[PDB]
Scaffold this motif. Structure first.
Motif, PDB file in Angstrom:
ATOM      1  N   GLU A 168      -5.684 -11.480   3.800  1.00 23.20           N
ATOM      2  CA  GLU A 168      -5.790 -10.601   4.969  1.00 23.20           C
ATOM      3  C   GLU A 168      -5.771  -9.103   4.610  1.00 23.20           C
ATOM      4  N   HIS A 169      -6.657  -8.320   5.248  1.00 21.51           N
ATOM      5  CA  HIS A 169      -6.781  -6.886   5.006  1.00 21.51           C
ATOM      6  C   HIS A 169      -6.213  -6.082   6.177  1.00 21.51           C
ATOM      7  N   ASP A 170      -5.002  -5.503   6.014  1.00 20.86           N
ATOM      8  CA  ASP A 170      -4.300  -4.795   7.098  1.00 20.86           C
ATOM      9  C   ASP A 170      -4.367  -3.272   7.048  1.00 20.86           C
ATOM     10  N   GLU A 171      -5.340  -2.734   6.331  1.00 16.55           N
ATOM     11  CA  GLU A 171      -5.501  -1.287   6.224  1.00 16.55           C
ATOM     12  C   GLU A 171      -6.935  -0.867   6.541  1.00 16.55           C
ATOM     13  N   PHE A 172      -7.190   0.452   6.600  1.00 17.01           N
ATOM     14  CA  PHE A 172      -8.541   0.939   6.879  1.00 17.01           C
ATOM     15  C   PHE A 172      -9.347   1.129   5.613  1.00 17.01           C
TER      16      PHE A 172
END
Ligand code: OLC
Ligand code: OLC
Ligand code: OLC
Ligand code: OLC
Lengths: 210, 6
Positions: B2-6
């Protein structure tokens, strides 16, 4: 969520608004690499496809939509609305030397061989080199306007703050992503000459000559 | 992952 991440997101949004308002108010995109704005739009497009598969928070969704919106709007002002002031003769970086290899590297070196992960990886590698056409244009033309240098400062500072954010997240949350980290280091080192010239020249009333 | 940043 930490102060380094939040300041990095504010620095990135500051840079995006500075450029967008500079072009809009002056009715000119002189000295702005249209090619770097195409690359940044392409980073947001490939990175944020997870808007259709995930909901992290209202902040996460809103920021992604604002970034896509402002990157596409900036591209529109350069290539359609104020195309009469787009300096195509000086924005001569051959972007195929960035896209074709970065595309090949994302397919080969990634965390997972699936379409969404390969596209995310492409966005990370491409972002690390996306500002190259703009810096190349400034070196060719010789000058960079003050507002263009403030745009480059806040854009360069954003991913430098993300590196500090990754130290924080590694120490406190045990989170670590080597692809984002190595690409983030590449992305920031490409601003080293600019940072030195911005601090010693621009912040002292002098000309930024690359 | 999962990618939780911009
Ligand atoms: C007229 C053109 C310029 C107009 C725009 C001026 C306002 C944008 C400034 C800052 C945005 C906030 C983020 C950038 C500032 C961070 C400075 C710093 O060193 O931050 C370390 C951080 O705070 C450790 O948590
Ligand atoms: C016109 C120029 C076009 C050519 C552009 C070529 C690409 C960018 C160039 C150099 C980056 C080299 C430095 C990158 C080093 C990254 C490795 C790194 O992060 O190492 C430390 C460790 O992994 C974490 O602490
Ligand atoms: C001049 C044109 C070419 C531009 C090329 C610019 C450099 C960036 C490329 C590669 C990574 C740089 C070195 C960083 C290597 C780190 C490897 C590492 O830490 O590997 C751990 C292991 O794989 C467990 O994940
Ligand atoms: C002019 C043409 C060249 C310009 C384009 C340069 C693109 C940016 C380069 C490297 C990004 C740094 C990250 C790549 C290194 C990955 C390190 C690593 O750990 O790879 C194994 C992975 O973790 C297994 O899941």
């Amino acid at each position: 969520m930490n102060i380094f991440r939040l300041t990095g997101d504010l620095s990135h949004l500051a840079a995006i608004i500075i450029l967008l308002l500079k072009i809009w108010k002056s009715r000119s995109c002189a000295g702005i690499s249209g090619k770097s704005q195409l690359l940044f739009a392409l980073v947001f497009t490939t990175r944020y496809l997870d808007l259709f598969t995930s909901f992290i928070s209202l902040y996460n969704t809103s920021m992604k939509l604002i970034y896509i919106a402002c990157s596409y709007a900036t591209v529109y002002l350069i290539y359609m609305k104020f195309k009469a002031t787009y300096d195509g003769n000086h924005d001569t970086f051959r972007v195929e030397f960035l896209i074709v290899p970065v595309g090949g590297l994302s397919f080969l070196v990634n965390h997972d061989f699936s379409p969404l992960e390969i596209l995310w990886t492409f966005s990370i590698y491409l972002e690390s080199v996306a500002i190259l056409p703009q810096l190349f244009m400034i070196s060719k033309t010789g000058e960079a306007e003050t507002i263009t240098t403030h745009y480059l400062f806040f854009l360069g500072l954003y991913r430098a703050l993300y590196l500090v954010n990754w130290i924080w997240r590694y120490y406190f949350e045990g989170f670590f992503d080597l692809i984002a980290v190595v690409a983030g280091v590449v992305q920031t080192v490409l601003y080293c000459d600019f940072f030195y010239l911005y601090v010693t020249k621009v912040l002292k009333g002098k000309k930024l000559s690359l | 992952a999962e990618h939780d940043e911009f």
